[PDB]
Structures are given as structure tokens and as C-alpha cells.
Design an enzyme around this catalytic site. Sequence first.
Site, PDB file in Angstrom:
ATOM      1  N   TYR A   6      -2.974  14.917  -1.919  1.00 16.28           N
ATOM      2  CA  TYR A   6      -3.492  14.248  -0.668  1.00 16.28           C
ATOM      3  C   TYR A   6      -4.573  14.897   0.087  1.00 16.28           C
ATOM      4  O   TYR A   6      -4.620  15.218   1.155  1.00 16.28           O
ATOM      5  CB  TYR A   6      -2.033  13.778   0.173  1.00 16.28           C
ATOM      6  N   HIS A  56      -8.794   8.691   4.302  1.00 16.95           N
ATOM      7  CA  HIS A  56      -8.968   7.347   4.701  1.00 16.95           C
ATOM      8  C   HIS A  56     -10.273   6.829   4.697  1.00 16.95           C
ATOM      9  O   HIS A  56     -10.314   5.678   4.891  1.00 16.95           O
ATOM     10  CB  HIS A  56      -8.225   7.073   6.014  1.00 16.95           C
ATOM     11  N   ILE A  91      -6.741  -9.528  19.335  1.00 16.83           N
ATOM     12  CA  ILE A  91      -8.127  -9.920  18.678  1.00 16.83           C
ATOM     13  C   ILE A  91      -8.110 -10.624  17.466  1.00 16.83           C
ATOM     14  O   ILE A  91      -7.696 -10.128  16.655  1.00 16.83           O
ATOM     15  CB  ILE A  91      -8.715  -8.567  18.634  1.00 16.83           C
ATOM     16  N   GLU A 104      -5.620   6.994  -1.602  1.00 20.45           N
ATOM     17  CA  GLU A 104      -5.617   5.956  -0.658  1.00 20.45           C
ATOM     18  C   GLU A 104      -6.215   4.920  -1.143  1.00 20.45           C
ATOM     19  O   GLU A 104      -5.897   3.521  -1.037  1.00 20.45           O
ATOM     20  CB  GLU A 104      -6.415   6.482   0.502  1.00 20.45           C
ATOM     21  N   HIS A 129       0.974  -1.177  -0.076  1.00 20.60           N
ATOM     22  CA  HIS A 129       0.132  -0.108  -0.033  1.00 20.60           C
ATOM     23  C   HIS A 129       0.866   1.158  -0.016  1.00 20.60           C
ATOM     24  O   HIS A 129       0.757   1.945  -0.948  1.00 20.60           O
ATOM     25  CB  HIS A 129      -0.953   0.155   1.293  1.00 20.60           C
ATOM     26  N   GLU A 130       2.027   1.322   0.717  1.00 19.23           N
ATOM     27  CA  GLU A 130       2.846   2.515   0.909  1.00 19.23           C
ATOM     28  C   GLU A 130       3.591   2.596  -0.383  1.00 19.23           C
ATOM     29  O   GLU A 130       3.891   3.777  -0.804  1.00 19.23           O
ATOM     30  CB  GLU A 130       3.580   2.333   2.200  1.00 19.23           C
ATOM     31  N   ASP A 135      -8.847  14.339   8.797  1.00 15.53           N
ATOM     32  CA  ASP A 135      -8.288  13.490   7.800  1.00 15.53           C
ATOM     33  C   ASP A 135      -8.036  14.194   6.424  1.00 15.53           C
ATOM     34  O   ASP A 135      -8.112  13.257   5.270  1.00 15.53           O
ATOM     35  CB  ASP A 135      -9.025  12.215   7.758  1.00 15.53           C
ATOM     36  N   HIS A 151       1.941   4.279  -3.093  1.00 12.18           N
ATOM     37  CA  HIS A 151       2.028   5.996  -3.139  1.00 12.18           C
ATOM     38  C   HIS A 151       3.025   6.282  -3.876  1.00 12.18           C
ATOM     39  O   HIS A 151       2.959   7.550  -4.494  1.00 12.18           O
ATOM     40  CB  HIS A 151       2.224   6.142  -1.646  1.00 12.18           C
ATOM     41  N   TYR A 191      -2.536  -5.730  12.637  1.00 10.13           N
ATOM     42  CA  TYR A 191      -3.350  -4.805  13.512  1.00 10.13           C
ATOM     43  C   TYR A 191      -3.702  -5.592  14.879  1.00 10.13           C
ATOM     44  O   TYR A 191      -4.198  -6.671  14.507  1.00 10.13           O
ATOM     45  CB  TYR A 191      -4.424  -4.628  12.803  1.00 10.13           C
ATOM     46  N   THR A 192      -3.773  -5.207  16.002  1.00 13.80           N
ATOM     47  CA  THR A 192      -4.290  -5.706  17.305  1.00 13.80           C
ATOM     48  C   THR A 192      -3.903  -7.217  17.433  1.00 13.80           C
ATOM     49  O   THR A 192      -4.864  -8.120  17.313  1.00 13.80           O
ATOM     50  CB  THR A 192      -5.777  -5.413  17.513  1.00 13.80           C
TER      51      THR A 192
HETATM   52 CA   LIG Z   1      -6.190  -8.259  15.035  1.00 15.33          CA
HETATM   53 ZN   LIG Z   2      -1.980   5.514   2.000  1.00 19.06          ZN
END
Ligand SMILES: [Ca+2]
Ligand SMILES: [Zn+2]
EC number: 3.4.24.27
Length: 316
Positions: free
Chosen positions: A157, A231, A197, A166, A142-143, A226, A146, A193-194
Site C-alpha cells: 500500500y 489515491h 451538489i 487503488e 472498490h473496498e 497519501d 482490496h 459524495y456531497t
Molecule cells: Ca454530490
Molecule cells: Zn482503495
Amino acid sequence: ITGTSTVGVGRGVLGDQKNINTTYSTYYYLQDNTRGDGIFTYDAKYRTTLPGSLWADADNQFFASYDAPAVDAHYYAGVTYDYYKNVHNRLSYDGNNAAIRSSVHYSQGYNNAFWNGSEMVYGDGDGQTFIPLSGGIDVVAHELTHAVTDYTAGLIYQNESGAINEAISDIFGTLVEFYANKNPDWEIGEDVYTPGISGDSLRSMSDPAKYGDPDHYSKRYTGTQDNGGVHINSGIINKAAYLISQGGTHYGVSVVGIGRDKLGKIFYRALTQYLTPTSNFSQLRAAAVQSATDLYGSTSQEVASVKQAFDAVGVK
Ligand SMILES: [Ca+2]
Ligand SMILES: [Zn+2]
Ligand SMILES: [Ca+2]
Ligand SMILES: [Ca+2]
Ligand SMILES: [Ca+2]
């Protein structure tokens, strides 16, 4: 550094073992001379000064927990370079084999990763919201996308052009994740992420509203946070791109999917030949329709599905 090309072994953020391209010259450096003008990985040593020091190791084995984010930043930049080269015939982000540089261990407990205009920067996360962000191949791709956008369409942006910028990064980040066949899906950032969870992610392309992002133009964010919702409003385009690929009926509009491969060729063509810095969602629809037309003919099923998908998310 000037030295001999060689291959080292290490473990990534998630514990998986992988081979990486390194260079030897007294120390073994994270410098891959097999792709373009090179892929270089730096240690920012918990500071914000960039790029930091090119990563040096004494025995070419990267199994320390401090090594993990470097291993994956270095390795997933290589996979993303291979995707763009093999699928789209593009050599690096500027199309002329520019060197790709990344720094890891940026700052302390930093929950983000970003292309700053010259190189990639990755935080280690705080250990609760995120683990080291280079462990997510979709985040890395993703990055790095850009950087491609910056050298081609140049989408600013902010407001609708930033939301397109994005979404284009989520789309190709996802296509790279499918290309590496790393447990692929239509969610973004689920591997990092997390850690506590199971089953969530930062954003969803198949159902953006699951995390509260809009999935229809009438639900778009109109305020100032934002940078005008770059986003948030990317959810409208992400849902369109998921429908073009996978098909489905959304707000009563039915779309026949045409697959990921054609999705990637249409959007890559739209990005490199028809988008400009201030393109809005309506101009993205025109660009994607014209691209599909160029590639498959104005009366193809591919053109029809691009039209239905934008109709389904309310973009005329
Ligand atoms: Ca997670
Ligand atoms: Zn981005
Ligand atoms: Ca070592
Ligand atoms: Ca995945
Ligand atoms: Ca994903």
C-alpha cells in the site's frame, strides 16, 4: 447464527426498496446463507470497536433510517460476491468462499469506508461531505476488491504498487456498478459524495484531471503524502483502463476501445497470475500485455489497444 434462511425487505441509503437474505432464530439477522460461507452485517453502534453486534431485527422489515446503511452494506456485498463468482469464477475474496463481514455505523460523522484486512467498515459520513458510504455500490466493490488483491497479488500500500492497488479497486468497483446496471458511469463515489451538489464525485476514471489527479505519467505525484500518492497516482492507471475499454485519443495517442468485458478479463488475469507485491507501473503494463496475449493472441487488436493505452498515459 444457526437458524432458518429467509428473505426480508428494506430500504437503502438512497430510498430504494430491496429484498435481502436474512436468517431467523428468535430475531431476524443480517446473515445471508446463500453465498459461500455467508455474508454477515454488524452494527458498530457509533463506536470504533469491531465488529460490533450481528445485526438483529424483530420483524424482518428494514425501513428505519438507522437500518439503511446495513441494508445496502449487506445487499451490495452480495452483488459483489455474485459478480466475482459469475464473471470470474472466483468464490469470495480468498477463492474458497470465505465469509464476508461488514460493520456499519462505525464511529460518528466518519467520512470513509475501508477493508481493514479482515472485514469491511463503513462510516455514516457527516451528512455534508458524504452520506452513509455503503449506499455507493462502486465504493463497496472498490473496498471488497482490496480483499481480492490482498489474497492474490498482495500489492503493498505505497508508492506505485499502492497506486496500482487503488486503481484495480476503482476498475472492478466500476465493473460491478455496470454489472448491477445501477445508473453506471466511470466516476467513483458519486451516489454518496456531497448530497448538496449534483454532478461531482470523488474521482473520475474518464478524466482524472477534472478533480486534479494526474492523467499522464509525467504528471505523477512524487512526494510523501497519501503513502506516496496511492489515491492520486491511481489516476494514471484509471485513465489507461478507461481508454482500453472505451477508446479515445489522449495526448495525441489514439486507442481503439475493446469494451468493459475484455477490460475485466485482462485485468483480472493480470492481478491473479502476474502481479506481485512490489510491481510498479511498468510491470503492470507488461502484465496486462501478457494477459491480453494469453487470452487473445499476440497479434490481436486487444493486445494492440492495451499497448496504445499505456503509451497514451506515458507508461513504458
Ligand atoms: Ca454530490
Ligand atoms: Zn482503495
Ligand atoms: Ca424491523
Ligand atoms: Ca453511477
Ligand atoms: Ca460510479
